[PDB]
Amino acid sequence: EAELSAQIRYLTQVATGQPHEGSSYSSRKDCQMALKRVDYARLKLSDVARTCEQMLEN
Amino acid sequence: SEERREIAEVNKKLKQKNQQLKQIMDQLRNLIWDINAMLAMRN
């Protein structure tokens, strides 16, 4: 009874009835763009290494 | 006269080598340009 009454009191102190307009979307978006930059560079490095292997292969 | 054919052999050899080097160089140029463009737009 003590714990649940205390937590209903604490929830009464920090309730607002409003849907919390904060977010973390933009940072996730920028992190996704950074990772796709890295992936693009990886594919291009694979292609350059493959042409180097074709040149050295003969 | 055979040394002329030797010259033609090595000429064809490094013709192919130079064209492959040009492809490697073009891909490096394009990767550098893409990196600089994509990193320039992030700000």
Swiss-Prot record, chain A:
Stated name of the protein: Mediator of RNA polymerase II transcription subunit 11
Give this protein's Gene Ontology molecular function annotations: transcription coregulator activity; ubiquitin protein ligase activity
State the oligomer form and interacting partners: Component of the Mediator complex, which is composed of MED1, MED4, MED6, MED7, MED8, MED9, MED10, MED11, MED12, MED13, MED13L, MED14, MED15, MED16, MED17, MED18, MED19, MED20, MED21, MED22, MED23, MED24, MED25, MED26, MED27, MED29, MED30, MED31, CCNC, CDK8 and CDC2L6/CDK11. The MED12, MED13, CCNC and CDK8 subunits form a distinct module termed the CDK8 module. Mediator containing the CDK8 module is less active than Mediator lacking this module in supporting transcriptional activation.
As for family, the record states: Belongs to the Mediator complex subunit 11 family.
Q: Where is the signal peptide?
A: none
The gene it comes from is MED11
- Write out the GO cellular component annotations: core mediator complex; mediator complex; nucleoplasm; nucleus; ubiquitin ligase complex
Its annotated compartments are: Nucleus
Per UniProt, the keywords (alphabetical) are:
Acetylation, Activator, Disease variant, Epilepsy, Neurodegeneration, Nucleus, Transcription, Transcription regulation
Task: Tell me yes or no: is Transcription among this UniProt entry's keywords.
Answer: yes
Which residues of the full-length protein are shown here? 60 to 117 of 117
From Swiss-Prot, chain B:
Q: Which domain of life is it from?
A: Eukaryota
Location comes to: Nucleus
| Tissue expression per record | Expressed in brain, heart, kidney, liver, lung, pancreas, placenta and skeletal muscle.
Chain coiled-coil ranges? 1-38
Q: Give the multimer and partner information.
A: Component of the Mediator complex, which is composed of MED1, MED4, MED6, MED7, MED8, MED9, MED10, MED11, MED12, MED13, MED13L, MED14, MED15, MED16, MED17, MED18, MED19, MED20, MED21, MED22, MED23, MED24, MED25, MED26, MED27, MED29, MED30, MED31, CCNC, CDK8 and CDC2L6/CDK11. The MED12, MED13, CCNC and CDK8 subunits form a distinct module termed the CDK8 module. Mediator containing the CDK8 module is less active than Mediator lacking this module in supporting transcriptional activation.
Job of this protein? Component of the Mediator complex, a coactivator involved in the regulated transcription of nearly all RNA polymerase II-dependent genes. Mediator functions as a bridge to convey information from gene-specific regulatory proteins to the basal RNA polymerase II transcription machinery. Mediator is recruited to promoters by direct interactions with regulatory proteins and serves as a scaffold for the assembly of a functional preinitiation complex with RNA polymerase II and the general transcription factors.
Family the entry assigns: Belongs to the Mediator complex subunit 30 family.
Name assigned to this protein = Mediator of RNA polymerase II transcription subunit 30
This protein's encoding gene: MED30
Please give the range of the full-length protein represented by this chain: 136 to 178 of 178
